[PDB]
Design a protein around this ligand. Structure first.
Ligand SMILES: CN1CCCc2c1cc(-c1ccccc1)[nH]c2=O
Ligand SMILES: [Zn+2]
Length: 208
């Protein structure tokens, strides 16, 4: 039941999603190994993901979390990079989309920095890079990220450099504690706590 609606670049909604994408690029401590070398993207397409069943699954869980946390869902818009972007937009997030080896346990991970999620589009640590050229820094091949609506509820704060959430919490927040420029990362342990709202198709751009 998923349909994808193209947004026009003239649409304010396209422009505000593009701006979140571009403005949350940072330098990474791997010098570009996982995700490539770039300071900005070429946005090719932004599509709204529309699925009634998946949306109702999300809002049902959101109300549950809200009612356990003084009517506060603590909802954020966050990036997600994954080889499984096509299954996610059709079937929703579930345990097969979890990062088993993640630093906060086996859950589904999200980033405030778009460039952090970009490191995962071709697999963990960038995998072997694009399927066509085997280049983690490919400037030709089209890449896709999700910009997702995520319910955090009561989030466990981890200071730092499928499982269950810590007792009494709905998520984990990974607060950057060494790299002063990094934004936060988040983990949920239930697929129903995220909805994949936008599909963004892009290229990374070679710096000039
Ligand atoms: C570990 N983090 C940091 C926050 C961003 C992020 C991940 C992991 C993944 C990931 C996705 C699928 C399979 C394994 C890891 N995707 C992401 O976008
Ligand atoms: Zn390529």
């Amino acid at each position: 039941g998923t349909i994808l609606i193209d947004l026009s670049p003239d649409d304010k909604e396209f422009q505000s999603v593009e701006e979140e994408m571009q403005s949350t690029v940072r330098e990474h401590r791997d010098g570009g190994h996982a995700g490539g070398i770039f300071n900005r993207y070429n946005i090719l397409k932004i599509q709204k993901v529309c699925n009634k069943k998946l949306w109702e699954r999300y809002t049902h869980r959101r109300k549950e979390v809200s009612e356990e946390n003084h009517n506060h869902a603590n909802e954020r818009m966050l990036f997600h990079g994954s080889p499984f972007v096509n299954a996610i937009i059709h079937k929703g997030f579930d345990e097969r989309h979890a990062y088993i080896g993640g630093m906060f346990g086996a859950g589904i991970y999200f980033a405030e920095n778009s460039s952090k999620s970009n490191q995962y589009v071709y697999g963990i640590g960038g995998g072997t890079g694009c399927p066509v050229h085997k280049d983690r820094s490919c400037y030709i091949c089209h890449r896709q990220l999700l910009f997702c609506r995520v319910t955090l509820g009561k989030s466990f704060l981890q200071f730092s450099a499928m499982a269950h959430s810590p007792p009494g919490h709905h998520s984990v927040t990974g607060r950057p504690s060494v790299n002063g420029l990094a934004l936060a990362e988040y983990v949920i342990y239930r697929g129903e706590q995220a909805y994949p709202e936008y599909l963004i198709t892009y290229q990374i751009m070679r710096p000039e």
